Scaffold this active site. Structure first.
Site, mmCIF file in Angstrom:
data_model
loop_
_atom_site.group_PDB
_atom_site.id
_atom_site.type_symbol
_atom_site.label_atom_id
_atom_site.label_comp_id
_atom_site.label_asym_id
_atom_site.label_seq_id
_atom_site.Cartn_x
_atom_site.Cartn_y
_atom_site.Cartn_z
ATOM 1 N N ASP A 85 8.988 -4.518 17.074
ATOM 2 C CA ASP A 85 9.989 -3.454 16.538
ATOM 3 C C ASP A 85 9.025 -2.347 15.948
ATOM 4 O OD1 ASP A 85 12.106 -2.505 14.015
ATOM 5 O OD2 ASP A 85 12.137 -1.869 16.236
ATOM 6 N N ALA A 97 1.496 5.116 1.044
ATOM 7 C CA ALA A 97 0.795 5.979 1.981
ATOM 8 C C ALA A 97 1.386 7.545 1.754
ATOM 9 C CB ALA A 97 1.554 5.677 3.480
ATOM 10 N N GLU A 153 0.678 -1.218 -0.010
ATOM 11 C CA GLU A 153 -0.026 -0.110 0.093
ATOM 12 C C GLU A 153 0.759 1.270 -0.098
ATOM 13 O OE1 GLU A 153 -2.826 2.357 3.074
ATOM 14 O OE2 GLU A 153 -2.875 0.260 3.323
ATOM 15 N N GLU A 191 10.098 5.567 11.774
ATOM 16 C CA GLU A 191 10.663 5.151 10.302
ATOM 17 C C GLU A 191 9.661 4.131 9.771
ATOM 18 O OE1 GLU A 191 14.973 3.796 10.921
ATOM 19 O OE2 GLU A 191 15.200 5.490 12.190
ATOM 20 N N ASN A 192 9.214 3.289 10.445
ATOM 21 C CA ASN A 192 8.156 2.477 10.274
ATOM 22 C C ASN A 192 6.647 2.665 10.336
ATOM 23 O OD1 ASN A 192 10.309 0.843 9.790
ATOM 24 N ND2 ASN A 192 10.306 -0.442 11.715
HETATM 25 N N1 LIG Z 1 4.077 2.266 1.033
HETATM 26 C C1 LIG Z 1 4.717 3.111 1.407
HETATM 27 N N2 LIG Z 1 4.668 4.510 1.194
HETATM 28 C C2 LIG Z 1 5.732 5.387 1.367
HETATM 29 N N3 LIG Z 1 6.739 5.262 1.738
HETATM 30 C C3 LIG Z 1 7.095 3.977 2.015
HETATM 31 C C4 LIG Z 1 6.327 3.067 1.950
HETATM 32 N N4 LIG Z 1 6.930 1.746 1.961
HETATM 33 C C5 LIG Z 1 8.008 2.009 2.626
HETATM 34 N N5 LIG Z 1 8.217 3.451 2.711
HETATM 35 C C6 LIG Z 1 9.335 4.355 2.999
HETATM 36 O O1 LIG Z 1 10.594 3.559 2.830
HETATM 37 C C7 LIG Z 1 11.285 3.180 4.010
HETATM 38 C C8 LIG Z 1 11.801 1.962 4.232
HETATM 39 O O2 LIG Z 1 10.642 0.981 4.710
HETATM 40 C C9 LIG Z 1 10.098 3.651 5.177
HETATM 41 O O3 LIG Z 1 10.775 3.872 6.060
HETATM 42 C C10 LIG Z 1 9.538 4.716 4.425
HETATM 43 O O4 LIG Z 1 10.222 5.890 4.393
#
Ligand SMILES: Nc1ncnc2c1ncn2[C@@H]1O[C@H](CO)[C@@H](O)[C@H]1O
EC number: 2.7.11.1
Length: 259
Positions: free
Chosen positions: A132, A89, A87, A136-137
């Site tokens: 975790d 975001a 997905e 960042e996540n």
């Molecule tokens: N679906 C997503 N939409 C936007 N940014 C993402 C998405 N998946 C990962 N990221 C970015 O990539 C990084 C590594 O997972 C995340 O911390 C985020 O910055």
């Protein structure tokens, strides 16, 4: 549930960078569906024992459906690579938002905590325990709603300790409560701008976590302090239930979202 190939997607700008792989904005060609495509080379993975870990992480993620949990649509691989269909975001990471803003107000923090708790309650019901979680996540939807992204560590240490609970770092076995600690750390970081146990040294952070040494800046309100202190107990047993967190007056006072 169908087999996907790179030919199916038009790939855009990189969303994020990681050592394991990079995340790209992508569009499915047939439906024009917009999504994030996460690219991991098999070789980087194989070098470490992640290859089993990734497959379980993919398995757990696919089944889960929640508003505050980032969806994983599918997965596929190419001769040298592994691709995750995720997905997308639009408002990006909380991390980026936090370093842009430097801190969050209680209303935004409480809302984030509430969404996190809701997402966490759902995970536990499915017997998924996270372990975790870090800014960042955490990703933000178009509405600005928080979404839990990774799960790459999901279960029923050379890496950073900042968000790990005392029980995990000390080698004690751990239960759901581990997530409650995570909630306490995040809530602190949202309000203060830095995780509570932050230190110059892994070894230093170890001790701070182990002793649960943290202090509050003056601007943190008594209501918040109470929630943090309950969350951050050394013994997992003392830590409150998620329902208890959702019902906390500070949450109730400042939250946009329901319990
Ligand atoms: N679906 C997503 N939409 C936007 N940014 C993402 C998405 N998946 C990962 N990221 C970015 O990539 C990084 C590594 O997972 C995340 O911390 C985020 O910055």
């Amino acid at each position: 549930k169908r087999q996907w190939a790179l030919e199916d997607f038009e790939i855009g700008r990189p969303l994020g960078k990681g050592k394991f792989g990079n995340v790209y904005l992508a569009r499915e060609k047939q439906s024009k569906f917009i999504l994030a495509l996460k690219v991991l080379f098999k070789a980087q993975l194989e070098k470490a024992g992640v290859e089993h870990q990734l497959r379980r992480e993919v398995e757990i993620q696919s089944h889960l459906r929640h508003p505050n949990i980032l969806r994983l649509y599918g997965y596929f691989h190419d001769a040298t690579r592994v691709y995750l269909i995720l997905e997308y975001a639009p408002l990006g990471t909380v991390y980026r938002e936090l370093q842009k803003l430097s801190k969050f107000d209680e209303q935004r923090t409480a809302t984030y905590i509430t969404e996190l708790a809701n997402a966490l309650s759902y995970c536990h019901s499915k017997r998924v325990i996270y372990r975790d979680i870090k800014p960042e996540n955490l990703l933000l939807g178009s509405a600005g709603e928080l979404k839990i992204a990774d799960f790459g560590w999901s279960v029923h240490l050379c890496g950073t300790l900042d968000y790990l609970p005392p029980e995990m770092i000390e080698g004690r076995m751990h239960d759901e409560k581990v997530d409650l600690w995570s909630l306490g750390v995040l809530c602190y970081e949202f309000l203060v701008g830095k995780p509570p146990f932050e230190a110059n040294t892994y070894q230093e952070t170890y001790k701070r976590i182990s002793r649960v040494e943290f202090t509050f800046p003056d601007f943190v309100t008594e209501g918040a302090r109470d929630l943090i202190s309950r969350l951050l107990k050394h013994n997992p047993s003392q830590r409150p239930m998620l329902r208890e967190v959702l019902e906390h007056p500070w949450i109730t006072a400042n939250s946009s979202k329901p319990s």
